[PDB]
Design a protein around this ligand. Structure first.
Ligand SMILES: *[C@@H]1O[C@H](CO[C@@H]2O[C@@H](C)[C@@H](O)[C@@H](O)[C@@H]2O)[C@@H](O[C@@H]2O[C@H](CO)[C@@H](O[C@@H]3O[C@H](CO[C@H]4O[C@H](CO[C@H]5O[C@H](CO)[C@@H](O)[C@H](O)[C@@H]5O)[C@@H](O)[C@H](O)[C@@H]4O)[C@@H](O)[C@H](O[C@H]4O[C@H](CO)[C@@H](O)[C@H](O)[C@@H]4O)[C@@H]3O)[C@H](O)[C@H]2NC(C)=O)[C@H](O)[C@H]1NC(C)=O
Ligand SMILES: *[C@@H]1O[C@H](CO)[C@@H](O[C@@H]2O[C@H](CO)[C@@H](O)[C@H](O)[C@H]2NC(C)=O)[C@H](O)[C@H]1NC(C)=O
Ligand SMILES: *[C@@H]1O[C@H](CO)[C@@H](O)[C@H](O)[C@H]1NC(C)=O
Ligand SMILES: *[C@@H]1O[C@H](CO)[C@@H](O)[C@H](O)[C@H]1NC(C)=O
Lengths: 93, 206, 193
């Protein structure tokens, strides 16, 4: 439901912000926790017949894995902002 | 309070510590098994008597004190097993949602930064507070007169993250005692932290 | 060299994008076009309401109907006479939100010892905003400030009856709905004493 994904999206955002801070300065712990939350967000979207939103959650889970090995500093910031932007959209609406 | 089993209550410090207390023919040894659904590990501890009909256990889930061992979507099955004549017998089995059973670590490092004849500013530090719940911190302090009771004391609420209070209307040359506690009211399903170690201070004489 | 457009979403009610027309020796009357990073619905749209400085386009105003916070906003400034003279920018709108000053501040006596402060937000949800409370006493000392997160209530556990207190708060669209860093204008002060 929307109330459940809103709560989980806020906690996923706290992981993503902490990881972005680590990248620009325990990352495996925050990333593993981030993956678990986005897995559950995708399942909650799948149960609510929002396949596109669930596809976004699965995409963000893969982006987080790529962020630890992405060479481009400009692409690292784009992927981090893209993850944060989507999570804030789930929290707002 | 735990949902599946009735008499067992477990609390999560929002980092890596889960503490369970059992409220009670009676065998010698009993243990507490915890296994998360998302995590492959399985943690165990032995119950020890604290007071009458109360047995406690401490599941240390991490290597660091500030390590985030559990998440909001985690769900670990807490089982109570007691050794009998034939061996381990499952006494209780229950589900446990960690961020719905939050009891943070009591505030520490209480000290007075300024003290007047009537004014006083008291600080305190916090530990083992998750980034998941850190912005939702809330504080409650109680000020009592020396010799009086803590139930008689006046409890002051800081519904924001302040970690200090400036006290006014204090009697000169008078000794007070203060305790503080902390909570995170995201969904208000968690309970208050224990009171801090009391801080005794006396105002400047008139 | 074209002036860089600077956009700000005000209380998620309207967006004012502006550029510095004084940078050019002759006012060339530039044109602004925008679109969003969304697939199969991607094409530019000319600014409907231009801003003006000396009868020359100073900027552009975008109404809430054309505002999508969480879709990447691509603004493009261009010279109508010379089309190759254009400048493009990539903007995250939720990080450029400036809220409207909080209103309807109310002080309440929670106890004989403590008093509580509560305010409200005009357009933006209270969950989204982050507040900064400032209070000072009759001594006219420096403001004592501290941030309250996502709940429009502030607590003052101990008060001096003789001293006269003042209160003011300001909001910010950070960090759970946006990552905006600009604080809103200060609210009207509320006094107690
Ligand atoms: C993992 O967590 C466990 C427990 O989880 C935590 O529970 C509570 C206490 C909160 O901190 C939660 O945030 C958290 O989930 C940790 O163990 C606890 O540690 C605290 C602090 O060290 C401790 O509380 C203090 O106990 C002091 C005495 O301890 C000895 O005796 C007790 C048995 O107590 C019995 O007897 C007393 C009278 O002597 C009775 O009042 C009481 O009701 C009991 O009948 C024994 O269990 C211990 O092992 C010791 O042998 C006591 O002096 C303290 O009081 C003072 O401090 C508090 C503030 O903390 C003030 O409020 C008071 O006014 C005093 O100034 C504390 O009460 C708990 O008993 C521990 N609980 C358990 C189950 O072990 C553990 O440390 C964590 N581990 C890690 C690795 O992080
Ligand atoms: C009581 O002491 C605290 C801690 O020193 C003071 O908190 C400071 O407040 C100012 C602004 O008011 C900040 O710039 C400092 O960073 C704060 N310090 C800390 C450690 O948080 C508080 O102001 C004092 N109370 C009064 C009434 O002055
Ligand atoms: C709107 O546009 C005008 C004109 O550039 C500008 O002065 C103002 O700051 C913008 N925002 C608001 C909230 O008025
Ligand atoms: C500049 O362009 C605007 C476009 O709306 C137009 O209204 C205005 O008259 C133009 N100014 C001059 C001097 O041509």
């Amino acid at each position: 439901p929307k109330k459940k994904i809103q709560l989980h999206a806020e906690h996923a955002l706290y992981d993503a912000l902490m990881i972005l801070n680590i990248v620009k300065t325990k990352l495996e712990d925050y990333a593993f926790n981030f993956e678990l939350i986005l897995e559950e967000i995708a399942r909650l979207f799948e149960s609510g017949d929002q396949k596109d939103e669930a596809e976004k959650a699965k995409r963000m889970k893969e982006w987080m894995k790529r962020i630890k090995t992405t060479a481009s500093e400009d692409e690292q910031e784009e992927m981090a902002n893209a993850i944060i932007t989507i999570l804030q959209s789930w929290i707002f609406s | 309070a735990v949902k599946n089993c009735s008499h067992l209550e477990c609390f999560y410090n929002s980092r890596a510590n889960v503490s369970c207390m059992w409220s009670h023919l009676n065998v010698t040894t009993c243990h507490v098994h915890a296994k998360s659904n998302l995590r492959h590990w399985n943690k165990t501890c032995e119950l020890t008597l604290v007071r009458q009909a109360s047995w406690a256990c401490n599941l240390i889930l991490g290597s660091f004190p500030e390590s985030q061992s559990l998440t909001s979507v985690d769900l670990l099955d807490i089982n109570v097993v007691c050794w009998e004549e034939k061996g381990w017998r499952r006494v209780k089995t229950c589900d446990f949602h960690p961020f719905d059973n939050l009891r943070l670590v009591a505030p520490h490092s209480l000290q007075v930064l300024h003290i007047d004849t009537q004014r006083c500013n008291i600080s305190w530090k916090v530990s083992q507070v998750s980034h998941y719940i850190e912005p939702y911190l809330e504080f409650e302090a109680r000020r009592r007169l020396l010799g009086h009771s803590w139930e008689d004391a006046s409890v002051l609420s800081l519904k924001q993250r302040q970690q200090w209070l400036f006290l006014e209307m204090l009697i000169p040359s008078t000794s007070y005692e203060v305790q503080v506690r902390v909570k995170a009211q995201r969904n208000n399903t968690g309970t208050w932290s224990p009171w801090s170690q009391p801080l005794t201070f006396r105002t400047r004489p008139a | 060299p074209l002036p860089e457009v600077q956009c700000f979403v005000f209380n998620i009610e309207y967006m004012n994008c502006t550029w510095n027309s004084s940078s050019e020796p002759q006012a060339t009357n530039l044109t602004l076009h925008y679109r969003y990073k969304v697939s199969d619905n991607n094409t530019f749209q000319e600014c409907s309401h231009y801003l003006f400085s000396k009868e020359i386009t100073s900027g552009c105003q975008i109404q809430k109907e054309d505002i999508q916070l969480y879709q990447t906003f691509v603004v493009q400034l261009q010279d109508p006479q010379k089309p190759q003279r254009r400048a493009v920018q990539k903007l995250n709108l939720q990080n450029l939100v400036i809220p409207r000053a909080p209103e309807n501040l109310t002080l309440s006596n929670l106890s004989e010892s403590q008093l509580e402060l509560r305010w409200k937000s005009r357009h933006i949800k209270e969950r989204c905003l982050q507040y900064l409370v400032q209070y000072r006493s009759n001594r006219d000392r420096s403001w004592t400030e501290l941030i309250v997160n996502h709940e429009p209530r502030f607590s003052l556990p101990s008060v001096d009856e003789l001293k006269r207190y003042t209160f003011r708060v300001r909001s910010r669209y950070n960090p759970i709905c946006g990552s905006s860093q600009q604080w809103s204008k200060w609210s009207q002060p509320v006094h107690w004493g």
